[PDB]
Write a protein that binds this ligand. Structure first.
Ligand SMILES: Nc1ncnc2c1ncn2[C@@H]1O[C@H](COP(=O)(O)OP(=O)(O)NP(=O)(O)O)[C@@H](O)[C@H]1O
Ligand SMILES: Nc1ncnc2c1ncn2[C@@H]1O[C@H](COP(=O)(O)OP(=O)(O)NP(=O)(O)O)[C@@H](O)[C@H]1O
Ligand SMILES: Cc1cn([C@H]2CC[C@@H](COP(=O)(O)O)O2)c(=O)[nH]c1=O
Ligand SMILES: Cc1cn([C@H]2CC[C@@H](COP(=O)(O)O)O2)c(=O)[nH]c1=O
Ligand SMILES: [Mg+2]
Ligand SMILES: [Mg+2]
Ligand SMILES: [Mg+2]
Lengths: 204, 204
């Protein structure tokens, strides 16, 4: 009985990390085997280059950095498939959608070109989008400015038109506990039902 | 008056490096401004990871390594465009075609998926393919085995069907000097004529 692949996405400060941590804790307390992942995964050689870039400690050509972000997901694919196969549900704080939205927000980057490197990755069984007015997110590195966030948000909305994916909108303006309950109930349903079918491939 | 972007491709031991070095020497002796590049470019952080992989000193997931090879080309794009704009002809020992052929030779890698990361790179004005029987190449790292080379060669032949590119076949079985003369005359023609048009974009 495989685990579910659950991804959390949203603009900066929407609550992705808080809710990913609380979801894994709640699932494990409810007897599931669940583990947390995040992207970028800065622990690897590629992840370190990405961390330096985001910190503005290094400059990286925009296409090159986009491919590094996708390569950082592929290096974790053997682990992701192994865990899911063993019945472990994986809760992932950012995935390919952030990769596409952030590079897609730059000039002269088509959504098509941005998606390609990630075509074929493990397809999430559930993609939660934590919605929050950009203005509220500001009430709570590179790319941390309003104009850029608005362009990334537009890209996210284009990705949501993709009916091949199980997108669920979450009202992230509520309290940490209320948002968590919403996400937890959606997650329990996905673990049970979304798993009756084989793990899919993203964007193919 | 821009420089030309000239790429040399071919199976292992076809003479790519020898002929790239001799071509830059001959062009400069004939009054052109020409410089040598190669891929992978192992001097960069990405290049070092690629060098370790090819030496079998490290293992890298196949999709991740494919993207690293393409990212290693993009990091050199600002330099490539600057040099070409200044009138310097660039002679490049391997490029995106090797990237696609080598990963494409692995199981479950479509040519389409392999091409995408490199879509948009500076388009070569001339792509020389140094042909040599696989058997002769053997008379003269990872991927250095006959069965794999044959699969890469098949991939190269698929890439050659692309009429958007100025492919020129070179009989690499001749002496070093004879092959060089063939390549030099083709290169002089490209520098003169292929340059009257703006630098193109690969696979788009
Ligand atoms: N529902 C919420 N209401 C109020 N504050 C919250 C809420 N969720 C998270 N926070 C706070 O907002 C800040 C950002 O939360 P965090 O979970 O780190 O968001 P994030 O989406 O992962 N941000 P980022 O990684 O920068 O895009 C933290 O100080 C949280 O404690
Ligand atoms: N036309 C030729 N005839 C005979 N030997 C040659 C010829 N061209 C190159 N060589 C020799 O063959 C070996 C491989 O040449 P080299 O130019 O390094 O090929 P290459 O295509 O760059 N190999 P690789 O990088 O491994 O795919 C060297 O020892 C060369 O001196
Ligand atoms: C996963 C991913 C993320 N991003 C950006 C968005 C947020 C930041 C990571 O923020 P953290 O510092 O919170 O880990 O890096 C990309 O540009 N591409 C990607 O593929
Ligand atoms: C440019 C490139 C090359 N290759 C392989 C072929 C030969 C070897 C480099 O050989 P050298 O050790 O001679 O530099 O690496 C790839 O798999 N992908 C690429 O994108
Ligand atoms: Mg976060
Ligand atoms: Mg396509
Ligand atoms: Mg060589």
């Amino acid at each position: 009985r495989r685990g579910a692949l659950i991804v959390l996405e949203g603009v900066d400060r929407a609550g992705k990390s808080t809710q990913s941590r609380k979801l894994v804790e709640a699932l494990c307390a409810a007897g599931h085997r669940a583990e947390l992942l995040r992207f970028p995964e800065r622990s690897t050689e590629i992840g370190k280059l990405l961390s330096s870039y985001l910190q503005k400690k290094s400059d990286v050509e925009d296409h090159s950095v986009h491919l590094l972000f996708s390569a950082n997901r592929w290096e974790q694919v053997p682990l992701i498939k192994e865990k899911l196969s063993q019945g472990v549900t994986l809760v992932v704080d950012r995935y390919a959608f952030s990769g596409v939205a952030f590079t897609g927000a730059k000039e002269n980057f088509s959504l098509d070109w941005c998606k390609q490197p990630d075509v074929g990755l493990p397809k999430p069984d559930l993609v939660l989008f934590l919605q929050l007015q950009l203005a509220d997110a500001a009430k709570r590195e590179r790319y941390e400015n309003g104009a850029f966030q608005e362009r990334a948000l537009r890209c996210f909305h284009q990705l949501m038109k993709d009916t091949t994916l199980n997108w669920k909108m979450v009202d992230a303006s509520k309290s940490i506990e209320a948002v968590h309950e919403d996400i937890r109930v959606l997650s329990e349903d996905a673990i049970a039902t979304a798993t009756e079918k084989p793990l899919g491939e993203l964007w193919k």
